[PDB]
Scaffold this active site. Structure first.
Site, PDB file in Angstrom:
ATOM      1  N   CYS A   4       0.831  -1.200   0.000  1.00 52.47           N
ATOM      2  CA  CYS A   4       0.000   0.000   0.000  1.00 52.47           C
ATOM      3  C   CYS A   4       0.867   1.253   0.000  1.00 52.47           C
ATOM      4  O   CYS A   4       0.611   2.199  -0.755  1.00 52.47           O
ATOM      5  CB  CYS A   4      -0.931   0.007   1.215  1.00 52.47           C
ATOM      6  N   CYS A  26      38.364  26.244  23.288  1.00 53.98           N
ATOM      7  CA  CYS A  26      37.984  25.185  22.360  1.00 53.98           C
ATOM      8  C   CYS A  26      36.470  25.098  22.219  1.00 53.98           C
ATOM      9  O   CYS A  26      35.950  24.937  21.107  1.00 53.98           O
ATOM     10  CB  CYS A  26      38.558  23.848  22.831  1.00 53.98           C
ATOM     11  N   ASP A  50      -4.259 -15.729  18.021  1.00 53.16           N
ATOM     12  CA  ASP A  50      -3.486 -15.596  16.799  1.00 53.16           C
ATOM     13  C   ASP A  50      -3.689 -16.834  15.928  1.00 53.16           C
ATOM     14  O   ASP A  50      -3.968 -17.931  16.418  1.00 53.16           O
ATOM     15  CB  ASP A  50      -2.003 -15.407  17.118  1.00 53.16           C
ATOM     16  N   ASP A  98       2.153 -15.748  19.807  1.00 51.97           N
ATOM     17  CA  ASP A  98       3.483 -16.349  19.807  1.00 51.97           C
ATOM     18  C   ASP A  98       4.444 -15.625  18.868  1.00 51.97           C
ATOM     19  O   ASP A  98       5.431 -16.219  18.422  1.00 51.97           O
ATOM     20  CB  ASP A  98       3.390 -17.831  19.435  1.00 51.97           C
TER      21      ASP A  98
HETATM   22  F1  ALF Z   1      -0.722 -14.228  12.473  1.00 51.35           F
HETATM   23 AL1  ALF Z   1       0.200 -13.653  13.888  1.00 51.35          AL
HETATM   24  F2  ALF Z   1       1.122 -13.079  15.305  1.00 51.35           F
HETATM   25  F3  ALF Z   1      -0.728 -12.129  13.876  1.00 51.35           F
HETATM   26  F4  ALF Z   1       1.128 -15.176  13.905  1.00 51.35           F
HETATM   27 MG    MG Z   2       1.874 -16.292  15.447  1.00 53.57          MG
END
Ligand code: ALF
Ligand code: MG
Length: 873
Positions: free
Chosen positions: A17, A87, A520, A729
């Site tokens: 983008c 100086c 996640d 993670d």
């Molecule tokens: F998809 Al991710 F931290 F946002 F592994």
């Molecule tokens: Mg991850």
């Protein structure tokens, strides 16, 4: 050049983008240059004012699909040899003479110098070079609480065990101990006075200062309670001893020097244990600082026919506009535009996925990314704090500082208790004074003090004061402090035994409040390593033979999908050893051609071509309708697919995709059944996120979410008054983990994610999260029970100390005070220890509870949100 304008851009989610915005804006006439950042959403445009206006620029940016709004350098150095004012004056004059420097000052006391200038014209390198030319060198520039509580506890113990032992010895039977050195005092009383004075002066000092701080805060806590009670008891004991001395009383009056050492002992121990439990070390900031590149290879002149010299310069000293050469395997020093370079970069810091991303001239790079496939030259655009990694560091700092301490339930209880004890003590005093005045026969009957020759009024006043202070001493709960620390430590031990590492006591007391959990996608919900999902056959050789041939062809491939395919083929086959004879040729991102003449080796256990649709189209191989439909379906599922042809004839197709964790669906179902919301937030493509959510049954999906957008979602959910647990993670998840009320990090995740999170799943099993809730519940209830044990034994004492049961024949005895503490502390400790019998619920129990209720979800029902504003479809 002049009248450069600043803009704020929102709705932008990809580095592509930024590249598109810059290219389009530079293409238009009048605009000279444009700069923008990803997370900051800030842009700077330089253009000729007489040709275009900022409103036109904003309209053009808006037309691109991103909302645009119009809105409105300091260096510190240390210089050696600054032993003379001449100086310094010469350096300052030379600095002012040079253009682009606004101000410059140097301090002789510390040799420090501060320079304010325009970054667009002057930089630290110019100042350093000028200083070097002049002839001088310049270079750019809880445990206390534990210690004090431990000291208080140790002093209180050292000088309180003797007094407690003396009290026990007196209670058991002792004639000498009652012997009087002076008519008022006795040996035991004098020893008690000395020991209590020493304990109050030494042990109570920190108690007194903490109580004063609490009063300054307009709040009363356990420290205030202990200070008030102990001071009152000590003052009364001293006063009664003094009056006994003055009047030369035959018998020494009873004293409360026992109480202050005891309360100081136990409350200091409880506070010390609490502070030990709360202590944690957060090194996520150090890890993030470690991620950034230490140095950069600056290239003078340009990448064109003139390349004069190269230098190694600290990334901090690097300034915009300098070409830096990044070699394969080297971290990208600064954000910039690639010029005369083509390679691959790993952007797991921002996007979070391990898939390499191509870099070509005109593309953009992010600081801290790992390069590969060759050398690149980059023209810097953002350096220092303006880098994306620096912005992530800033977000982590903000999230960590935002967190506020959680008030202990002990403090809340003491806040009510202090007025309660004061009221009951005053009531006891006044009622006893009234009883003595009106009748005075009760005082004669129930007390021997009437034998004294003092006036009746003195008798009643002394009896009332003594009874009130006995009630005050009995009311104090000695085991109040230990109730929460003991349970917290036992719960932490149980969690560690069960495979959950809990840092601090807050997560155990907070997990039960969680009503929303964000997961996640990569790693947390699905295995990070890509794996082959399905292989199809498009003259009719066995599938295993083709798989072995491909594995031999793909053995040397460095693409992650290549290793996934090779390992899948090896697992399918005996894979005793790969074919010795193999010729390999690869075209980046186009296809790979190999020659394999060792099919005999495969049989014991002649060309190969691996490619996409474009490879078949350019090679001249047509695509059938059925295979096209299959590839379309695979693309819809979001799984990558590649095709294998032998001798110029299409032979097969292999699909690779991430595999959802086995317990992810069960964990999500259990969380939903418990009433907790489940949200899938990820930086991957929308299609893959939707497919993963469908597999794991998550209704709410967020895709292409930048690290700042995750924190924004956390903040929104918290503003809804909900308590949020974030499971991540990756580095991008670290700011969200820090901001989230609870942060859970997978054991196989990055170091920064583990450091930021307050809970770590060593067993890297999602179901433990549910356990992390259940255990927390089992903890909090226990704590409440402990608090009952902390008070009940003392509370039952109050009616007895006040003489409620006196007519029935029940009166307070000296041993009762010690017995109350003994019982309360023993009960609290045993109740806390009983938590060690907690058993983690079995996975079979989860499956049986959801045996029939669990059901797959339709893809249509799921709604995918792209970005914070959901501008895109
Ligand atoms: F998809 Al991710 F931290 F946002 F592994
Ligand atoms: Mg991850």
């Amino acid at each position: 050049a002049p009248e450069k304008c600043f803009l704020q851009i929102t709705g932008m989610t990809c580095i592509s983008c930024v590249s598109n915005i810059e290219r389009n804006l530079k293409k238009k006439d009048g605009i000279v240059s444009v700069l923008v950042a990803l997370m900051s959403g800030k842009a700077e445009v330089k253009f000729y004012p007489d040709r275009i206006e900022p409103l036109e620029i904003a309209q053009l940016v808006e037309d691109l699909g991103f909302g645009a709004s119009v809105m409105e350098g300091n260096v510190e150095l240390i210089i050696t040899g600054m032993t003379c004012a001449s100086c310094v004056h010469n350096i300052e004059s030379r600095l002012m003479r040079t253009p682009g420097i606004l101000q410059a000052s140097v301090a002789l006391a510390t040799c420090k110098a501060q320079v304010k200038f325009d970054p667009e014209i002057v930089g630290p390198r110019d100042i350093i070079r000028i200083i070097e030319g002049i002839g001088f060198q310049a270079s750019l520039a809880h445990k206390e609480e534990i210690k004090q509580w431990r000291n208080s506890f140790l002093f209180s113990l050292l000088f309180g065990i003797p007094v407690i032992i003396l009290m026990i010895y007196m209670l058991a039977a002792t004639m000498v101990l009652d012997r009087n050195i002076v008519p008022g005092l006795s040996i035991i009383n004098l020893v008690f006075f000395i020991l209590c004075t020493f304990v109050q002066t030494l042990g109570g000092r920190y108690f007194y200062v903490q109580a004063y701080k609490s009063l300054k805060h307009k709040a009363t806590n356990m420290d205030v309670l202990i200070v008030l009670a102990t001071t009152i008891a000590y003052i009364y004991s001293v006063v009664i001893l003094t009056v006994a001395m003055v009047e030369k009383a035959d018998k020494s009056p009873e004293t409360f020097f026992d109480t202050p050492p005891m309360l100081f002992m136990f409350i200091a121990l409880g506070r010390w244990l609490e502070h030990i439990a709360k202590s944690k070390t957060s090194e996520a900031l150090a890890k993030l600082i470690s991620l950034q590149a230490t140095e950069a290879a600056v290239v003078t002149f340009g990448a064109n026919q003139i390349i004069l010299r190269e230098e190694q310069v600290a990334v901090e000293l690097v300034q915009r506009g300098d070409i830096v050469k990044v070699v394969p395997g080297g971290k990208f020093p600064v954000d910039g535009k690639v010029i005369e370079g083509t390679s691959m970069a790993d952007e797991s810091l921002i996007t979070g996925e391990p898939m390499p991303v191509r870099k070509k001239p005109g593309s953009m790079v992010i600081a801290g990314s790992i390069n590969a496939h060759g050398t690149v030259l980059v023209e810097a655009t953002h350096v220092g704090s303006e880098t994306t990694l620096a912005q992530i560091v800033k977000l982590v700092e903000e999230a960590q500082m935002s967190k506020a301490p959680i008030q202990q339930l002990a403090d809340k209880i003491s806040g009510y208790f202090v007025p309660f004890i004061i009221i009951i003590s005053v009531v006891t005093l006044v009622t006893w004074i009234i009883i003595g005045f009106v009748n005075f026969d009760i005082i004669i009957k129930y007390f021997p003090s009437y034998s004294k020759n003092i006036s009746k009024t003195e008798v009643i006043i002394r009896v009332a004061f003594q009874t009130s202070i006995t009630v005050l001493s009995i009311a104090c709960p000695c085991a109040l402090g230990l109730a929460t620390p003991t349970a917290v430590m036992v719960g932490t031990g149980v969690a560690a035994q069960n495979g959950i590492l809990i840092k601090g006591g807050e997560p155990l007391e907070m997990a039960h409040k969680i009503k929303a959990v964000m997961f996640d996608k990569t790693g947390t919900i699905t295995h990070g390593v890509p794996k082959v999902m399905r292989v199809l056959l498009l003259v009719k050789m066995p599938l295993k033979r083709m798989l072995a041939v491909v594995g031999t062809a793909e053995a040397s491939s460095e693409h992650p999908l290549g290793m996934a395919v090779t390992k899948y083929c090896k697992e399918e086959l005996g894979t005793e050893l790969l074919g010795y004879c193999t010729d390999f040729q690869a075209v980046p991102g186009c296809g790979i051609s190999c020659k394999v003449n060792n099919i005999e080796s495969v049989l014991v256990q002649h060309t190969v071509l691996i490619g996409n649709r474009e490879w078949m189209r350019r090679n001249g191989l047509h695509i059938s309708t059925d295979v096209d439909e299959a590839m379309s379906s695979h693309e819809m599922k979001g799984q990558t697919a590649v095709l294998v042809a032998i001798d110029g004839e299409l032979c097969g197709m292999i699909a690779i995709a991430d595999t959802v964790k086995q317990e992810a669906a069960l964990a999500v179902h259990t969380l939903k059944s418990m009433g907790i919301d489940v949200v899938l937030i990820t930086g991957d493509n929308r299609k893959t996120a939707k497919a993963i959510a469908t597999q794991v049954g998550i209704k709410k999906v967020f895709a292409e979410v930048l690290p700042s957008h995750k924190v924004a979602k956390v903040q929104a959910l918290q503003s809804d008054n909900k308590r949020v647990a974030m499971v991540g993670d990756g580095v991008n998840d670290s700011p969200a983990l820090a901001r989230a009320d609870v942060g859970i990090a997978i054991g196989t995740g990055t170091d920064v994610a583990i450091e930021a999170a307050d809970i770590v799943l060593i067993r890297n099993d999602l179901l433990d999260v549910v356990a992390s809730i259940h255990l927390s519940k089992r903890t909090v209830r226990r704590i409440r029970l402990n608090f009952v044990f902390a008070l009940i034994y003392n509370l039952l004492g109050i009616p007895i100390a006040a003489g409620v049961f006196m007519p029935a024949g029940l009166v307070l005895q000296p041993w009762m005070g010690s017995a109350a503490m003994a019982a309360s502390s023993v009960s609290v400790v045993l109740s806390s220890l009983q938590l060690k019998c907690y058993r983690k619920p079995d996975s079979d129990r989860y499956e049986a509870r959801a045996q029939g209720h669990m059901k797959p979800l339709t893809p249509s029902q799921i709604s995918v949100h792209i970005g914070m504003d959901d501008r895109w479809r």
